[PDB]
Amino acid sequence: GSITENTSWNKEFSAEAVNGVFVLCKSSSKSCATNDLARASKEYLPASTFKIPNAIIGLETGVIKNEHQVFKWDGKPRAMKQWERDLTLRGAIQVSAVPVFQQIAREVGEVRMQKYLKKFSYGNQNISGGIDKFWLEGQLRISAVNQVEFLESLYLNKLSASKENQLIVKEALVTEAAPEYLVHSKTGYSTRIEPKIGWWVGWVEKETEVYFFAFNMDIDNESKLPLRKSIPTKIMESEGII
Amino acid sequence: GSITENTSWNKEFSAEAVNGVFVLCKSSSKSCATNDLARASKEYLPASTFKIPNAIIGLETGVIKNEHQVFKWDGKPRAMKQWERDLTLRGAIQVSAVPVFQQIAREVGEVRMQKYLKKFSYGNQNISGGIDKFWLEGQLRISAVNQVEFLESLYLNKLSASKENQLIVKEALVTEAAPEYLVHSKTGYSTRIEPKIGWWVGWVEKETEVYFFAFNMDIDNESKLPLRKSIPTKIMESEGII
Ligand SMILES: C[C@@H](O)[C@@H](C(=O)O)[C@@H]1NC(C(=O)O)=C(S[C@@H]2CN[C@H](CNC(N)(O)O)C2)[C@@H]1C
Ligand SMILES: [Cl-]
């Protein structure tokens, strides 16, 4: 594919003193727009955005039994009170229940995990660093361009997984719905390797058009985290995606 | 499962001077409640709620290719301006584009439509009145209890159709996404036989519970139509669900 710089987008980043990139593609990833050619292809830890491939692989390997799977809490202490409860797949995504996804990865195992990430062309495809933490502090890395390519394949049911499993994950990623406007999206925040990276990736359907998007930025402190959503939203609104 | 009458929910009807029924079922306990057992079993034209089985049968039969199909507007005037445009499958369901679904029903044909409504146990299964209007002014009738049974079967993929097609229709029905819950739903308004009936049917997923719902009411005039959503929302708010 082909990626074209929109210089007018930078004002959005400089105004807040952000180093970041936004990639946005209408209809397909054949042709994408960005504020920064270089950074659009730079690879970073996925952090919780990896919950998207992880869920697909969990379903594809039968570790997650089906769409109605309940991840049962055994009652032993977890790090966050929001995690101390039985969860659905969507629930685990909404509360960012890392430990649920860790147990999924352990059950998938390194051999199967490595195979699906290569079939999915998922970032640098490197799962070194321990089966439960490679996407949090190991060697895996992916770019904003690669995230849009991956999400486009998921939208099209073109990943190397059943259509049923791709539909199941897609439903769990819906974050906004209206009669002719539907958003699928996912945040991430990588804090374990410097610089810290904030993500927001997804796609938007508006009438009969679709737009795939991925945003990342350097995160100085937690107070900057809302810009992950507000900068990309402002740019998308500038394209009439409202 | 079970059903119990709960006449307290009558507060909301008597306030608004409405004759109608709500049926709300908790999946895990297999238990339903209703303000009115008799009306819960009365059977009415499904009107636009028929878009749910019709979409499923459309896909099952190959009439609808998949969830990416776009139904193009041919430029002829439509009963609602909001219909005068190309629509996706989700968009055609959510704006209730009757002309789109009449065309689907024509291509499905009488033999196939009958076969499916029998498999789905859908209301009285009577498709007399003409293959493109039987659900709007013909002989077809369904009760609130029947609607919740049907929606539970869809949820569980137990309809006689592929899991893939059931899932496609499930995502098309999403109407509200919140952190704590996801609502799938569909409105209807039956105007071609008196008295006029307003419907709202669907389900709410919250925590690891699922609640199926069906609401209908006599509509005295267009100005009452919001009550189709507002009375059931108020009850579900009282019940701590949404
Ligand atoms: C739980 C943690 O290990 C991460 C994970 O891998 O899921 C969490 N994932 C995310 C995320 O955004 O997806 C986070 S952000 C952190 C918890 N939620 C807060 C949201 N901050 C704000 N202000 O932007 O809403 C701050 C956490 C770091
Ligand atoms: Cl950890």
B162's CB contacts (< 8 A; 6+ apart) are: B60
Determine contact, residues A125/A117, Cβ cutoff 8 Å: yes
Kindly provide the residue ranges of all beta strands, DSSP E only, lying in A83-208, ordered along the sequence.
Answer: 174-178, 181-190, 197-206
Measured distance between the N- and C-terminal CA atoms of chain B, rounded to whole angstroms:
23
Bin A22: left if φ > 0, else alpha if -120 < ψ < 50, else beta.
beta
φ, ψ of residue B3 in degrees (nearest 5): -140, 140
The amino acid sitting at A81 is K
H helix intervals, B7-162: 10-16, 37-41, 51-60, 89-94, 98-108, 110-119, 144-155
Partner B contacted by A208 (CB < 8 A): yes
Residue A223 per-residue DSSP state: G
Measured distance CA(B104)–CA(A231) in Å, rounded: 42
Peptide bond into B77 cis (omega under 30): no
φ, ψ of residue B138 in degrees (nearest 5): -95, -145
Q: Residue with structure tokens 């390797």?
A: A193
Structure tokens at A207: 């009438």
Determine contact, residues B131/B54, Cβ cutoff 8 Å: no
Q: Is the dihedral of CA B190, B196, B202, B206 positive or negative?
A: positive
Residue to mutate (ligand 1; options A187, A196, A217, A219; most atoms within 8 A of CB): A187
Bin B240: left if φ > 0, else alpha if -120 < ψ < 50, else beta.
left
Which of A48, A42, A41, A43 minimizes the C-alpha distance to A1?
Answer: A41
Q: Residue with structure tokens 């990416």?
A: B68
Give A65 to chain B, closest Cα distance, Å. 13
Helix (H) or strand (E) segment spanning residue A33: strand A31-34
Of B163, B164, B177, the CB nearest to A174: B177
Number of H-type helices and E-type strands within chain B: 9, 11
φ, ψ of residue A126 in degrees (nearest 5): -100, 115
Determine contact, residues A216/A224, Cβ cutoff 8 Å: no
Top residue of A180, A181, A183, A229 to mutate, by most chain B CBs within 10 Å, is: A180
Determine contact, residues B87/B97, Cβ cutoff 8 Å: yes
| SS3 annotation, A94-105 | HCCCHHHHHHHH
Measured distance CA(B24)–CA(B214) in Å, rounded: 7
- Stated resolution in angstroms: 1.7
- Alpha carbon B195 to its chain centroid, in Å, reads 19
Long-range contacts of B131-136 (CB under 8 A, 24+ apart): B131/B105, B131/B106, B132/B102, B132/B103, B132/B105, B132/B106, B133/B102, B135/B45, B135/B46, B135/B47, B135/B50, B135/B54, B136/B45, B136/B47, B136/B50, B136/B98, B136/B190, B136/B192
Closest residue by Cα to atom 13, ligand 1, is: A188
Chain B residues whose CB is inside 8 A of the A208 CB are 70, 86-88, 91
Residue to mutate (ligand 1; options A54, A96, A192; most atoms within 8 A of CB): A96
Q: Is B160 among the residues known to form the active site?
A: no
Structure tokens at B38: 């008799």
Exposure string for A12-39, b = 16+ CB within 10 A, e = fewer = bbeeeebebbbbbbeeebeebbbbbeeb
Measured distance CA(A3)–CA(B115) in Å, rounded: 51
Chain B residues whose CB is inside 8 A of the A70 CB are 208
Span from the CA of A133 to the centroid of ligand 2 (angstroms): 6
Question: Residue A238 in 3-state DSSP?
Answer: helix
Which of A31, A6, A23, A232 minimizes the C-alpha distance to A143?
Answer: A23
CA torsion A139-A144-A145-A148 (nearest 10°) is 110
Question: Residue B4 in 3-state DSSP?
Answer: strand
Distances (CA, A) of B237 to A162, A223, B190, B194: 37, 33, 26, 31
The amino acid sitting at B30 is K
Give B28 to chain A, closest Cα distance, Å. 12
How many contacts (CB atoms, under 8 Å) link A and B?
64
Question: Would you say domain B1-242 falls under CATH 3.20.20.100?
Answer: no
Which of B93, B18, B14, B87 minimizes the C-alpha distance to B56?
Answer: B93
Structure tokens at A79: 């790090």
Residue A66 per-residue DSSP state: S
Measured distance CA(B197)–CA(B216) in Å, rounded: 7
A136's CB contacts (< 8 A; 6+ apart) are: A45, A47, A98, A190, A192
Measured distance between the N- and C-terminal CA atoms of chain A, rounded to whole angstroms:
26
Closest residue by Cα to atom 15, ligand 1, is: A189
Parallel, antiparallel or unpaired: strands A31-34 and A2-5: parallel
Query: A74 labelled as ligand-binding?
Result: no
Question: Residue B105 in 3-state DSSP?
Answer: helix
Partner B contacted by A119 (CB < 8 A): no
Question: Residue B124 in 3-state DSSP?
Answer: coil
Cβ(A82) – ligand 1 distance below 6 Å: no
Measured distance CA(B216)–CA(B133) in Å, rounded: 20
Chain A residues whose CB is inside 8 A of the B91 CB are 179-180, 207-208
Q: Residue with structure tokens 């938007």?
A: A204
Measured distance CA(B111)–CA(A96) in Å, rounded: 49
B179's CB contacts (< 8 A; 6+ apart) are: A94
Question: Residue A138 in 3-state DSSP?
Answer: coil
Helix (H) or strand (E) segment spanning residue B23: strand B20-26
- Alpha carbon B219 to its chain centroid, in Å, reads 17
Of B70, B167, B182, the CB nearest to A208: B70
Determine contact, residues B155/B212, Cβ cutoff 8 Å: yes
Q: Residue with structure tokens 């919001």?
A: B226
Give the bridge partners for A44, in sequence order: A142
Span from the CA of A95 to the centroid of ligand 1 (angstroms): 9
Of A163, A167, A208, the CB nearest to B88: A208
Question: Residue B3 in 3-state DSSP?
Answer: strand
A141's CB contacts (< 8 A; 6+ apart) are: A43, A44, A45, A46, A123, A124, A126
Within 10 Å of residue A196's Cβ, how many Cβ atoms? 20
Where in the sequence numbering do the catalytic residues of A fall?
48
Cβ(A225) – ligand 1 distance below 6 Å: yes
Comparing alpha-carbon positions, the chain A residue that sits nearest to B93 is A179
Exactly one of B8, B41, B48, B153 is catalytic; name it.
Answer: B48
Residue A71 per-residue DSSP state: B
